[PDB]
Amino acid sequence: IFECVFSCDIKKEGKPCKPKGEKKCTGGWRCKIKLCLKI
């Protein structure tokens, strides 16, 4: 899995990462402030 943290925070995440614990967001989704936004 592509590491990061994925707390979906702009700094814990905040780029294309891997939604851990998310039901909607899939891998390759950039957390961007509000939510996960696929790249």
Side-chain angles (χ1 to χ4, degrees):
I1 192 175
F2 41 80
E3 302 174 273
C4 86
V5 186
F6 202 99
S7 312
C8 195
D9 290 83
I10 183 176
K11 190 176 298 181
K12 303 288 292 184
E13 222 288 65
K15 57 190 60 54
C17 288
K18 25 79 276 173
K20 190 178 190 63
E22 240 296 298
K23 303 181 184 64
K24 303 179 299 183
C25 313
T26 319
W29 284 45
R30 299 172 297 193
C31 295
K32 181 178 295 299
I33 305 175
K34 301 165 57 179
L35 48 70
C36 321
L37 176 65
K38 60 280 178 53
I39 193 292

CSV table of all heavy atoms in Angstrom, one decimal:
chain,number,residue,atom,x,y,z
A,1,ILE,N,0.9,-1.2,0.0
A,1,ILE,CA,0.0,0.0,0.0
A,1,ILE,C,0.9,1.2,0.0
A,1,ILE,O,2.0,1.2,0.6
A,1,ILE,CB,-0.9,0.0,1.3
A,1,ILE,CG1,-2.1,1.0,1.1
A,1,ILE,CG2,-0.2,0.1,2.6
A,1,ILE,CD1,-3.1,1.0,2.3
A,2,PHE,N,0.5,2.3,-0.7
A,2,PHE,CA,1.4,3.5,-0.8
A,2,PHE,C,1.5,4.4,0.5
A,2,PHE,O,1.0,5.5,0.5
A,2,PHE,CB,1.5,4.3,-2.1
A,2,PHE,CG,0.2,4.4,-2.8
A,2,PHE,CD1,-0.7,5.4,-2.5
A,2,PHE,CD2,-0.1,3.6,-3.9
A,2,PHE,CE1,-1.9,5.6,-3.2
A,2,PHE,CE2,-1.3,3.8,-4.6
A,2,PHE,CZ,-2.2,4.8,-4.2
A,3,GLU,N,2.0,3.8,1.5
A,3,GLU,CA,2.4,4.4,2.8
A,3,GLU,C,1.6,5.5,3.4
A,3,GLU,O,0.6,5.2,4.1
A,3,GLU,CB,3.9,4.8,2.8
A,3,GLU,CG,4.9,3.6,2.5
A,3,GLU,CD,6.3,4.1,2.3
A,3,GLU,OE1,6.6,4.5,1.2
A,3,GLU,OE2,7.0,4.1,3.3
A,4,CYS,N,2.0,6.7,3.1
A,4,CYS,CA,1.7,8.0,3.7
A,4,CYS,C,1.2,7.8,5.2
A,4,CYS,O,1.8,7.2,6.0
A,4,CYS,CB,0.9,8.9,2.8
A,4,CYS,SG,-0.9,8.8,2.8
A,5,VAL,N,0.0,8.4,5.4
A,5,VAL,CA,-0.7,8.2,6.7
A,5,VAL,C,-2.1,8.1,6.3
A,5,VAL,O,-2.8,7.1,6.7
A,5,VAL,CB,-0.5,9.4,7.6
A,5,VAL,CG1,-1.2,9.1,9.0
A,5,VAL,CG2,0.9,9.8,7.8
A,6,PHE,N,-2.6,9.0,5.5
A,6,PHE,CA,-3.9,9.1,5.0
A,6,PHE,C,-4.9,9.4,6.1
A,6,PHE,O,-5.8,8.6,6.4
A,6,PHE,CB,-4.4,8.0,4.2
A,6,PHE,CG,-5.6,8.4,3.3
A,6,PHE,CD1,-5.3,8.7,1.9
A,6,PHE,CD2,-6.9,8.5,3.7
A,6,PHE,CE1,-6.3,9.0,1.1
A,6,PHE,CE2,-7.9,8.9,2.9
A,6,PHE,CZ,-7.6,9.1,1.5
A,7,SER,N,-4.7,10.5,6.8
A,7,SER,CA,-5.7,11.0,7.8
A,7,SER,C,-6.5,12.0,7.0
A,7,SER,O,-7.4,12.6,7.6
A,7,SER,CB,-5.0,11.6,8.9
A,7,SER,OG,-3.9,10.8,9.4
A,8,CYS,N,-6.2,12.1,5.7
A,8,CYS,CA,-6.9,13.0,4.8
A,8,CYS,C,-6.7,14.5,5.1
A,8,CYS,O,-7.3,15.4,4.4
A,8,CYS,CB,-8.3,12.6,4.5
A,8,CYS,SG,-9.1,13.3,3.0
A,9,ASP,N,-5.9,14.8,6.1
A,9,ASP,CA,-5.5,16.1,6.4
A,9,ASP,C,-4.6,16.6,5.3
A,9,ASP,O,-4.0,15.8,4.7
A,9,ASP,CB,-4.6,16.1,7.7
A,9,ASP,CG,-5.4,15.9,8.9
A,9,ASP,OD1,-5.6,14.7,9.3
A,9,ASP,OD2,-5.8,16.8,9.6
A,10,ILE,N,-4.6,17.8,5.1
A,10,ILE,CA,-3.8,18.5,4.1
A,10,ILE,C,-2.3,18.2,4.2
A,10,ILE,O,-1.5,18.3,3.3
A,10,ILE,CB,-4.0,20.0,4.2
A,10,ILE,CG1,-3.3,20.8,3.1
A,10,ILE,CG2,-3.7,20.5,5.6
A,10,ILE,CD1,-3.6,22.2,3.0
A,11,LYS,N,-1.8,17.8,5.4
A,11,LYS,CA,-0.4,17.5,5.6
A,11,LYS,C,-0.2,16.0,6.0
A,11,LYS,O,0.9,15.4,5.7
A,11,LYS,CB,0.2,18.4,6.6
A,11,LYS,CG,1.7,18.4,6.7
A,11,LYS,CD,2.2,19.4,7.7
A,11,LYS,CE,1.9,20.8,7.2
A,11,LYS,NZ,2.5,21.9,8.2
A,12,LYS,N,-1.1,15.4,6.6
A,12,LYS,CA,-1.0,13.9,7.0
A,12,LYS,C,-1.2,13.1,5.7
A,12,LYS,O,-0.8,12.0,5.6
A,12,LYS,CB,-2.1,13.5,8.0
A,12,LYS,CG,-2.1,14.3,9.3
A,12,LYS,CD,-1.0,14.0,10.2
A,12,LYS,CE,-1.1,12.6,10.8
A,12,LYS,NZ,-0.1,12.2,11.7
A,13,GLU,N,-2.0,13.7,4.8
A,13,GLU,CA,-2.2,13.3,3.5
A,13,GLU,C,-2.0,14.6,2.7
A,13,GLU,O,-1.1,15.4,3.0
A,13,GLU,CB,-3.6,12.8,3.5
A,13,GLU,CG,-3.6,11.5,2.7
A,13,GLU,CD,-3.4,11.8,1.2
A,13,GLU,OE1,-2.4,12.2,0.8
A,13,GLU,OE2,-4.4,11.6,0.5
A,14,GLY,N,-2.7,14.8,1.6
A,14,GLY,CA,-2.7,16.0,0.9
A,14,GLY,C,-1.9,15.8,-0.4
A,14,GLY,O,-0.9,16.6,-0.6
A,15,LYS,N,-2.3,14.8,-1.2
A,15,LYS,CA,-1.6,14.3,-2.4
A,15,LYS,C,-2.2,13.0,-2.7
A,15,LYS,O,-3.1,12.5,-1.9
A,15,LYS,CB,-0.1,14.2,-2.0
A,15,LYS,CG,0.2,13.3,-0.8
A,15,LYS,CD,1.7,13.4,-0.4
A,15,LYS,CE,2.1,14.8,0.0
A,15,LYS,NZ,1.2,15.4,1.0
A,16,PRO,N,-1.8,12.2,-3.8
A,16,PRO,CA,-2.5,10.9,-4.1
A,16,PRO,C,-2.0,9.8,-3.2
A,16,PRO,O,-0.9,9.4,-3.3
A,16,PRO,CB,-2.1,10.7,-5.5
A,16,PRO,CG,-0.9,11.5,-5.9
A,16,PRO,CD,-0.8,12.6,-4.8
A,17,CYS,N,-2.8,9.5,-2.3
A,17,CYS,CA,-2.5,8.5,-1.3
A,17,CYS,C,-3.6,7.4,-1.2
A,17,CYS,O,-4.5,7.3,-2.2
A,17,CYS,CB,-2.3,9.1,0.0
A,17,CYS,SG,-0.7,10.0,0.2
A,18,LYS,N,-3.5,6.6,-0.2
A,18,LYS,CA,-4.4,5.4,-0.1
A,18,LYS,C,-5.3,5.5,1.1
A,18,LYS,O,-5.0,5.4,2.3
A,18,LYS,CB,-3.5,4.2,0.0
A,18,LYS,CG,-2.0,4.4,0.5
A,18,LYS,CD,-1.8,4.5,2.0
A,18,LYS,CE,-2.1,5.9,2.6
A,18,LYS,NZ,-2.0,5.8,4.1
A,19,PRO,N,-6.6,5.7,0.8
A,19,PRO,CA,-7.7,5.8,1.8
A,19,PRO,C,-7.8,4.6,2.7
A,19,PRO,O,-8.4,3.5,2.3
A,19,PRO,CB,-9.0,5.9,0.9
A,19,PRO,CG,-8.5,6.4,-0.4
A,19,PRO,CD,-7.1,5.8,-0.6
A,20,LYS,N,-7.3,4.7,3.9
A,20,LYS,CA,-7.4,3.7,4.8
A,20,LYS,C,-8.5,4.0,5.8
A,20,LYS,O,-8.5,5.0,6.4
A,20,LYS,CB,-6.1,3.5,5.6
A,20,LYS,CG,-6.0,2.3,6.4
A,20,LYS,CD,-4.7,2.1,7.2
A,20,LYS,CE,-4.6,0.8,7.8
A,20,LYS,NZ,-4.6,-0.3,6.8
A,21,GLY,N,-9.5,3.2,5.7
A,21,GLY,CA,-10.7,3.3,6.5
A,21,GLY,C,-11.8,4.0,5.8
A,21,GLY,O,-12.9,4.3,6.4
A,22,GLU,N,-11.6,4.4,4.6
A,22,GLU,CA,-12.6,5.1,3.8
A,22,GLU,C,-13.4,4.1,3.0
A,22,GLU,O,-12.8,3.1,2.6
A,22,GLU,CB,-11.9,6.1,2.9
A,22,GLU,CG,-12.4,7.5,3.1
A,22,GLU,CD,-13.8,7.7,2.8
A,22,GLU,OE1,-14.2,7.5,1.6
A,22,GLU,OE2,-14.6,8.0,3.7
A,23,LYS,N,-14.6,4.4,2.8
A,23,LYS,CA,-15.5,3.5,2.1
A,23,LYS,C,-15.7,4.0,0.6
A,23,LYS,O,-16.1,3.2,-0.3
A,23,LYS,CB,-16.9,3.3,2.8
A,23,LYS,CG,-16.8,2.9,4.2
A,23,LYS,CD,-18.2,2.7,4.8
A,23,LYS,CE,-18.1,2.3,6.3
A,23,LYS,NZ,-17.4,3.4,7.1
A,24,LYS,N,-15.5,5.3,0.4
A,24,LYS,CA,-15.8,5.9,-0.9
A,24,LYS,C,-14.5,6.1,-1.7
A,24,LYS,O,-14.5,5.8,-2.9
A,24,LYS,CB,-16.6,7.2,-0.7
A,24,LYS,CG,-17.8,7.1,0.1
A,24,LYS,CD,-18.5,8.4,0.3
A,24,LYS,CE,-17.7,9.4,1.1
A,24,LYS,NZ,-18.3,10.7,1.3
A,25,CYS,N,-13.6,6.6,-1.0
A,25,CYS,CA,-12.3,7.0,-1.6
A,25,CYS,C,-11.5,5.7,-1.9
A,25,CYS,O,-11.5,4.8,-1.0
A,25,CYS,CB,-11.6,7.9,-0.7
A,25,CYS,SG,-12.7,9.3,-0.1
A,26,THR,N,-10.9,5.6,-3.0
A,26,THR,CA,-10.1,4.4,-3.4
A,26,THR,C,-8.6,4.8,-3.6
A,26,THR,O,-8.3,6.0,-3.4
A,26,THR,CB,-10.6,3.9,-4.8
A,26,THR,OG1,-12.1,4.0,-4.7
A,26,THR,CG2,-10.3,2.4,-5.0
A,27,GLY,N,-7.7,3.9,-3.9
A,27,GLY,CA,-6.3,4.2,-4.0
A,27,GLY,C,-6.0,5.1,-5.2
A,27,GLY,O,-6.5,5.0,-6.2
A,28,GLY,N,-5.1,6.1,-4.9
A,28,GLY,CA,-4.8,7.1,-6.0
A,28,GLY,C,-5.6,8.3,-5.9
A,28,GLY,O,-5.9,9.0,-6.9
A,29,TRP,N,-6.1,8.5,-4.7
A,29,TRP,CA,-6.9,9.6,-4.4
A,29,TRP,C,-6.2,10.6,-3.6
A,29,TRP,O,-5.5,10.3,-2.6
A,29,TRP,CB,-8.2,9.2,-3.8
A,29,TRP,CG,-9.2,8.6,-4.7
A,29,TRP,CD1,-9.0,7.6,-5.7
A,29,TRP,CD2,-10.6,8.8,-4.8
A,29,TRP,NE1,-10.1,7.3,-6.3
A,29,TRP,CE2,-11.1,8.0,-5.8
A,29,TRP,CE3,-11.5,9.6,-4.1
A,29,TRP,CZ2,-12.5,8.0,-6.2
A,29,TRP,CZ3,-12.9,9.6,-4.4
A,29,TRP,CH2,-13.3,8.8,-5.5
A,30,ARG,N,-6.2,11.8,-4.1
A,30,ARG,CA,-5.5,12.9,-3.4
A,30,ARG,C,-6.3,13.5,-2.4
A,30,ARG,O,-7.3,14.2,-2.7
A,30,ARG,CB,-5.1,14.0,-4.5
A,30,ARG,CG,-4.3,13.5,-5.6
A,30,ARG,CD,-4.1,14.6,-6.6
A,30,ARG,NE,-5.4,14.9,-7.2
A,30,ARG,CZ,-5.7,15.6,-8.3
A,30,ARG,NH1,-4.7,16.2,-8.9
A,30,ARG,NH2,-6.9,15.7,-8.8
A,31,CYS,N,-6.0,13.4,-1.1
A,31,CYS,CA,-6.6,14.2,-0.2
A,31,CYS,C,-6.3,15.6,-0.4
A,31,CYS,O,-5.1,15.9,-0.7
A,31,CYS,CB,-6.3,13.8,1.3
A,31,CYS,SG,-6.9,12.2,1.7
A,32,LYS,N,-7.3,16.4,-0.5
A,32,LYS,CA,-7.2,17.7,-0.8
A,32,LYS,C,-8.1,18.5,0.1
A,32,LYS,O,-9.3,18.6,-0.2
A,32,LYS,CB,-7.6,18.0,-2.3
A,32,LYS,CG,-7.5,19.4,-2.7
A,32,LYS,CD,-7.8,19.6,-4.2
A,32,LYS,CE,-6.7,18.9,-5.1
A,32,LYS,NZ,-5.4,19.4,-4.9
A,33,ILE,N,-7.6,18.8,1.3
A,33,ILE,CA,-8.3,19.7,2.3
A,33,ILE,C,-9.6,19.2,2.9
A,33,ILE,O,-9.7,18.9,4.0
A,33,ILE,CB,-8.5,21.2,1.7
A,33,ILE,CG1,-7.2,21.8,1.2
A,33,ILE,CG2,-9.1,22.1,2.8
A,33,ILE,CD1,-7.4,23.1,0.5
A,34,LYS,N,-10.6,19.0,2.0
A,34,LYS,CA,-11.9,18.6,2.3
A,34,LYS,C,-12.1,17.1,2.2
A,34,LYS,O,-12.6,16.5,3.1
A,34,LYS,CB,-12.8,19.3,1.3
A,34,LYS,CG,-12.8,20.8,1.3
A,34,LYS,CD,-13.4,21.4,0.1
A,34,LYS,CE,-14.9,21.0,-0.1
A,34,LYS,NZ,-15.5,21.5,-1.3
A,35,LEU,N,-11.6,16.6,1.1
A,35,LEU,CA,-11.8,15.2,0.8
A,35,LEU,C,-10.8,14.6,-0.1
A,35,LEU,O,-9.8,15.2,-0.4
A,35,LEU,CB,-13.3,15.0,0.3
A,35,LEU,CG,-13.7,15.9,-0.9
A,35,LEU,CD1,-13.0,15.7,-2.2
A,35,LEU,CD2,-15.2,15.9,-1.0
A,36,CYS,N,-11.0,13.3,-0.4
A,36,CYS,CA,-10.2,12.6,-1.3
A,36,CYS,C,-10.6,12.8,-2.7
A,36,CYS,O,-11.8,12.7,-3.1
A,36,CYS,CB,-10.3,11.1,-1.0
A,36,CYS,SG,-10.5,10.7,0.7
A,37,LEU,N,-9.7,13.3,-3.6
A,37,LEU,CA,-10.0,13.6,-4.9
A,37,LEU,C,-9.0,12.8,-5.8
A,37,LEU,O,-7.8,13.2,-5.9
A,37,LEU,CB,-9.9,15.1,-5.1
A,37,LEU,CG,-10.0,15.6,-6.5
A,37,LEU,CD1,-11.4,15.4,-7.0
A,37,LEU,CD2,-9.6,17.1,-6.5
A,38,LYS,N,-9.5,11.8,-6.5
A,38,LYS,CA,-8.8,11.0,-7.5
A,38,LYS,C,-7.9,11.8,-8.4
A,38,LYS,O,-8.2,12.9,-8.8
A,38,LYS,CB,-9.7,10.1,-8.3
A,38,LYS,CG,-10.8,10.8,-9.2
A,38,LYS,CD,-12.0,11.3,-8.4
A,38,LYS,CE,-13.0,12.0,-9.3
A,38,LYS,NZ,-13.3,11.3,-10.5
A,39,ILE,N,-6.7,11.3,-8.7
A,39,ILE,CA,-5.8,11.9,-9.6
A,39,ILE,C,-6.0,11.3,-11.0
A,39,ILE,O,-5.9,10.0,-11.1
A,39,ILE,CB,-4.3,11.8,-9.1
A,39,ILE,CG1,-3.3,12.7,-9.8
A,39,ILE,CG2,-3.8,10.3,-9.0
A,39,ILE,CD1,-3.0,12.4,-11.3
